[PDB]
A and B are shown apart, each in its own frame.
With several copies, the nearest count.
Chain A
Amino acid sequence: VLCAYVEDPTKSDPPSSSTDQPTTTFTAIDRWYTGRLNSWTKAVKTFSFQAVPLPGAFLSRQGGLNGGAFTATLHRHFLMKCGWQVQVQCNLTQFHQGALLVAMVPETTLDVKPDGKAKSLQELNEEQWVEMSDDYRTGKNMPFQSLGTYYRPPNWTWGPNFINPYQVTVFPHQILNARTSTSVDINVPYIGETPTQSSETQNSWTLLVMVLVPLDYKEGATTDPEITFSVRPTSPYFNGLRNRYT
C-alpha cells in the first residue's frame, strides 16, 4: 500500500479553521466505494489517461460510483477534510502486455473540457479515454476567464494545471504492469491551500489511470480487461453543519 508523504495518512488533527465540533464520522466508514471505469483496449494510444476526481466522483457518480451515506454526509456539511485511499483493479492476464500508471494527482482540472465548463456523464462515455494532446501538455484547457468585450482576449498559450505526461511518476503512483501485479494500492493524506477546503467544490486529489504501454494481446486470447476502482476516505473531518446542498 503506497502511503503518501507520511508513515500513516490516517493521522489527521481537526482543522484549525473552525470553532465547532467536527463531524468526525458517519454511518459506514469502514467500507469501500466501487465504481466502474472504462475498459482498456488496443486502440488506446500512449498517454491516453482517464481521470477520476475526488470528491468529484461521489457527486457526479462517475461510473456508478455510489457514495451511499458519504455523499449524503458531504452534502450536509460545508467544509470537508479527508485523506483518500484508492484501489484500482484490472484483470491483467498472462496473455496481455502493457502498463497502466495509476496515480493520485494533486490539484488538477483533468475532468474539464478543453473548451467549456465541466464534463457530463454522456461525454465521458463517448470518448472513453482522454488523449494527451497539446492542450493537456501545455495546460491550455483549464477554463479561460470571460474577460468581456472591453479587454481584447489574449492568446492563452499556457496554464499551470498541465500534465507533463513523462513526469507523472513523481506523484503517489504504482505501475499496473502486465507481469508484476494486477492491482494498485495508494493511500494519500489530506492536502490543501487551507486546513480544510469546501465540500461541493474541491479537487484536492485526482485518481489518474494513464496508459504508458499500449495494450497488446493475441487474437482469440483474453480480451479487453476492465478497470475498476475503490475510493474510501480516511479520517474525514466535516465542519459547518447545514441542510442539503441546492
Chain B
Amino acid sequence: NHTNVKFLFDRSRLLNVIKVLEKDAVFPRPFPTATGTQQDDGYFCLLTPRPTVASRPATRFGLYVSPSDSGVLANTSLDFNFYSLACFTYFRSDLEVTVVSLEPDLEFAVGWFPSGSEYQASSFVYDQLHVPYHFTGRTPRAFASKGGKVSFVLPWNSVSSVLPVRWGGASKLSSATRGLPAHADWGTIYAFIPRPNEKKSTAVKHVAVYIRYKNARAWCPSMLPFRSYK
C-alpha cells in the first residue's frame, strides 16, 4: 500500500523559503499593487500546494529567468512533489507545518492566522519599546528555542469543503478571476524574531517552511502534468 493516498502525501516536503520579520509587518496589499506602496514582501507563507504570488493565491505558477533590477521580485511558491503525483481534483487533509531555520543559531518564532483571517499589523508601546501585535493573539504563535525547529499540525480550517487541485470557476466576477480559488488554504504563517523593533538588525534572515499532509483524502480522478520530449 505505498500508492495509498493517505500514505503517499503523509510526508514532509519543502514549500517556501520566507524571510523572517524584524518589525511590525505590513501585509502585502491585494492585486493589483501600484508602485510606491510601502509594504513588506515575501515574509508570509500561504500554506497551499497551489501556486502563489506575493503570499496570495495565484492562478498560474511563475518563476524568474532573468531577474533584472526594475520592480520588486515576488516570492512564488509551489509544491513540486504534490502536482506530479496529484492525479485528482480535490484534496482535503490536515496540514503539519515544520519551520526549519536557514540561519546559524537563530531564535525565531512562527505566527499563524486561519483561512480567511488577516494579519494584525500594528504595534503597542510596551516600556518604550515597539512590541508588535503579532506577539499576542488567539492563534498559535509557537516559539522556537535558540537553534530549534517549530512543528505543529493545523486542521482543515477553510470554509471550502475541500481544496481544489484543479478549479475552473470564478471566485469573484469574471475577466481574469477564472481558475482562482479564494478559500483554498490552511492559512498563512510567518517567522518573527521575538525581540522588539528597536532591536531590529540589519541582516535579512531567511527560514524554510516544510509541509506534511496528515490524513490525506483525494477525490475526482484527473490528470498529471505534461512531461516534455526534449
State if A and B touch, Cβ cutoff 8 Å. Answer: yes
Interface residues of A (CB under 8 A from B): 5, 53, 106-109, 112, 116-118, 137-140, 142-165, 167-168, 170-171, 191, 193-195, 197-198, 201-204, 206
Using Cβ atoms and an 8 Å threshold, which residues of chain A touch B188?
none
18 contacts between A and B (CB under 8 A): A106-B166, A107-B169, A117-B175, A117-B176, A142-B178, A143-B177, A145-B180, A153-B62, A154-B64, A155-B64, A156-B62, A158-B51, A159-B60, A160-B83, A162-B223, A170-B87, A193-B183, A198-B169
CB contact between B169 and one of A116, A149, A203 (< 8 Å): that residue: A203
Contact status A195-B31, CB under 8 Å:
no
> Which residues does chain B contribute within 8 Å of A193, judged by CB atoms?
90, 160-164, 167, 181, 183-184
Q: Given contacts A118-B178, A146-B176, is CB(A154)–CB(B63) below 8 Å?
A: yes
SS class, residues of chain A in contact with chain B: loop
B residues apposed to A, CB below 8 Å: 31-37, 41, 50-51, 53-54, 58-65, 67-68, 70-74, 76, 78, 83, 87, 89-90, 160-171, 173-181, 183-184, 219-226
Contacts of A148 in B (CB 8 A): 31-35
Cβ-Cβ contact count across A and B, 8 Å cutoff: 189
Min Cβ gap B220→A in Å is: 5
The residue in chain A whose Cβ has the minimal distance to the Cβ of B171 is A201
Nearest CB of A to B217, in Å: 14
Given A106-B89, A193-B184, the answer on whether A147 and B51 have CB atoms closer than 8 Å is no
**Partner of A202 from B71, B169, B180 at Cβ < 8 Å:** B169
